[PDB]
Amino acid sequence: SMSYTWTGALITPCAAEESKLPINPLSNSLLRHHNMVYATTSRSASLRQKKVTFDRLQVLDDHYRDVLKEMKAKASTVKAKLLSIEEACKLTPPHSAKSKFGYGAKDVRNLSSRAVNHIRSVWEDLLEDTETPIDTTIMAKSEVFCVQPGRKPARLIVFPDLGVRVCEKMALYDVVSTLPQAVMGSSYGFQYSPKQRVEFLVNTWKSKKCPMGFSYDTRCFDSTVTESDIRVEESIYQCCDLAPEARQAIRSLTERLYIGGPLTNSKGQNCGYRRCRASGVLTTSCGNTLTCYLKATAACRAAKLQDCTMLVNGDDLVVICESAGTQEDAAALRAFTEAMTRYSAPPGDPPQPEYDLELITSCSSNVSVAHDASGKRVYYLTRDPTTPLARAAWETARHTPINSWLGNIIMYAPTLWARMILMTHFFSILLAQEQLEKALDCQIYGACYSIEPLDLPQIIERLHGLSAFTLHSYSPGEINRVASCLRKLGVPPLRTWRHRARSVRAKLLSQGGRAATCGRYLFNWAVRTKLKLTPIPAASQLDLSGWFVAGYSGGDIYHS
Numbered sequence: 387s388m389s390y391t392w393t394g395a396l397i398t399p400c401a402a403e404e405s406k407l408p409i410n411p412l413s414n415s416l417l418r419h420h421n422m423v424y425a426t427t428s429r430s431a432s433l434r435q436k437k438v439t440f441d442r443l444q445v446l447d448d449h450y451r452d453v454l455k456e457m458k459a460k461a462s463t464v465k466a467k468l469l470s471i472e473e474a475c476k477l478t479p480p481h482s483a484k485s486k487f488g489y490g491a492k493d494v495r496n497l498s499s500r501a502v503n504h505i506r507s508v509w510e511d512l513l514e515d516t517e518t519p520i521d522t523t524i525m526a527k528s529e530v531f532c533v534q535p536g537r538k539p540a541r542l543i544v545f546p547d548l549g550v551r552v553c554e555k556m557a558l559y560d561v562v563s564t565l566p567q568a569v570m571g572s573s574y575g576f577q578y579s580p581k582q583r584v585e586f587l588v589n590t591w592k593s594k595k596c597p598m599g600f601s602y603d604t605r606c607f608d609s610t611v612t613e614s615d616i617r618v619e620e621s622i623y624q625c626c627d628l629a630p631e632a633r634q635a636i637r638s639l640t641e642r643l644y645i646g647g648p649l650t651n652s653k654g655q656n657c658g659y660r661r662c663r664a665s666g667v668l669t670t671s672c673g674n675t676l677t678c679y680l681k682a683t684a685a686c687r688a689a690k691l692q693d694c695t696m697l698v699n700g701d702d703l704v705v706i707c708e709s710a711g712t713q714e715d716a717a718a719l720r721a722f723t724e725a726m727t728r729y730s731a732p733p734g735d736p737p738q739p740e741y742d743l744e745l746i747t748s749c750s751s752n753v754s755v756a757h758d759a760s761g762k763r764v765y766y767l768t769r770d771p772t773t774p775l776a777r778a779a780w781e782t783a784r785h786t787p788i789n790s791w792l793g794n795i796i797m798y799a800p801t802l803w804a805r806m807i808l809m810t811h812f813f814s815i816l817l818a819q820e821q822l823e824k825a826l827d828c829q830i831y832g833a834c835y836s837i838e839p840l841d842l843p844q845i846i847e848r849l850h851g852l853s854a855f856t857l858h859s860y861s862p863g864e865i866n867r868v869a870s871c872l873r874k875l876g877v878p879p880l881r882t883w884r885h886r887a888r889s890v891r892a893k894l895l896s897q898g899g900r901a902a903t904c905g906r907y908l909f910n911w912a913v914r915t916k917l918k919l920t921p922i923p924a925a926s927q928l929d930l931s932g933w934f935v936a937g938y939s940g941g942d943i944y945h946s
């Protein structure tokens with residue numbers, strides 16, 4: 387069927403939308419070419435609409451069915467619990483879109499009578515009505531990027547009302563948080579921290595006699611997901627031991643919300659109908675991960691790739707296997723692509739076999755190597771800094787609910803660019819405004835967290851190790867990419883950042899306390915006379931296990 391059907395009504399904005407990087411004095415110290423930075427708006431909605439609207443083609447085969455049964459067999463060991471309205475409420479982000487039934491996120495979190503009673507009525511409705519399509523809202527997403535040799539059309543987000551979202555958590559939060567790992571095991575990407583992902587990728591790469599790997603980009607994955615995929619996805623959920631009400635909610639949610647439904651713009655107009663994956667539901671990440679894994683695992687058998695190992699994060703996929711030669715590898719890959727195409731997962735960028743791990747990009751990142759103080763090689767996760775820097779520039783020119791720069795500092799703490807630039811720039815600004823102690827929100831694997839800047843040293847030590855504060859001698863390729871990026875965006879050269887860093891470092895030390903800890907560890911690279919970096923006490927008590935359990939992008943999840 388058609389992923390979408392449109393009535394003609396437009397995808398409209400909720401309020402005024404900014405596209406150009408604002409007028410301010412602090413962003414310019416980060417990057418001078420501000421005209422290269424832009425945010426997507428609803429004005430480009432029609433372009434995305436054209437791209438995501440098409441008739442899907444899907445032909446299943448024995449390999450697909452064999453893998454599905456294998457997945458259900460593992461799903462069968464799971465026992466999911468029903469969340470209480472109170473538990474489900476606490477997971478709701480403070481800034482979650484308000485309900486159109488007289489209440490918002492705050493009321494939900496406060497368990498206000500008006501919110502709880504309506505949520506309860508939505509739940510009962512899910513137990514009684516098994517057919518009526520649930521209404522959703524479709525909006526153009528606002529995201530920041532840097533122009534390319536031009537601009538990207540805004541993506542479309544589709545989500546149900548706040549009440550329905552709370553009900554989703556009640557019935558499926560435990561499922562989407564535990565099942566993926568039980569079904570895919572080591573292949574489930576979100577169970578890893580950046581350091582662990584690298585370890586998994588490096589070990590997997592070293593386990594092959596002659597390794598060959600590739601990233602597979604599915605063209606607009608969400609719209610390639612068919613009604614059949616969503617029901618197959620549910621059949622896996624149904625293998626879990628579930629409470630009767632959870633089982634009915636999952637069944638109802640599947641037919642009423644997940645497989646499709648009517649779209650309404652921000653002005654309450656009927657925009658059309660969806661018959662593919664909605665981006666803003668609790669099962670999007672889990673569902674995409676399961677579906678991608680299922681199709682890829684089956685495609686590999688069809689293509690006859692030797693000893694395949696998948697790493698899947700939602701619609702993102704990387705496959706590492708045994709090489710059978712250059713010609714055979716390229717032929718097998720093309721066979722793989724055809725299999726995926728039949729499963730309704732056609733490629734955007736055609737895949738290409740890689741024989742160098744560092745050249746494989748997955749989750750917009752790649753594994754690279756550097757050296758610690760003692761000169762020992764260390765593997766870490768990095769990525770092209772273009773988007774991170776553009777967004778950091780934007781978040782500097784104006785307030786944003788989520789601080790991507792903080793998230794990028796945590797996930798990419800070992801990188802040459804995060805240390806030289808993001809840390810220096812943001813700590814410098816925080817000092818000036820005297821907000822080093824204020825907690826800021828950021829996202830990790832879609833879930834929202836509240837982080838205190840001054841706790842960064844501990845966090846980084848725990849997630850990356852002490853080597854994150856001593857890495858040097860980065861690879862030629864990594865250095866080239868960072869340098870090119872800085873030249874392109876008009877970002878000051880290393881010398882300027884070292885100077886700014888020395889100054890930030892000094893101010894931080896004179897303040898003592900945690901600030902002084904930030905000064906010693908985060909900026910040890912800026913000074914000539916190094917300081918001996920020993921394990922930080924608070925880094926031995928950090929409860930960071932819950933940070934890397936599952937994916938929640940689009941899930942409206944908040945962890946306090």
Ligand SMILES: COc1ccc(C(=O)Nc2ccc(Oc3ccc(N(C(=O)[C@H]4CC[C@H](C)CC4)C(C)C)c(C(=O)O)c3)cc2)cc1
Nearest residue numbers: 802805806857858859860865869872873877878879880911
């Ligand atoms: C105007 O156009 C331009 C814009 C930008 C640039 C530019 O910055 N180019 C530009 C920026 C970075 C470059 O790579 C470097 C520089 C110093 C390093 N070193 C370090 O100790 C670093 C350790 C990590 C820490 C975070 C920084 C120091 C020493 C070897 C000297 C390392 C490394 O460790 O591999 C790598 C090269 C060119 C050049 C021109």
Ligand SMILES: [Mg+2]
Nearest residue numbers: 603604605606
């Ligand atoms: Mg894609």
Ligand SMILES: [Mg+2]
Nearest residue numbers: 577578579934
């Ligand atoms: Mg973990």
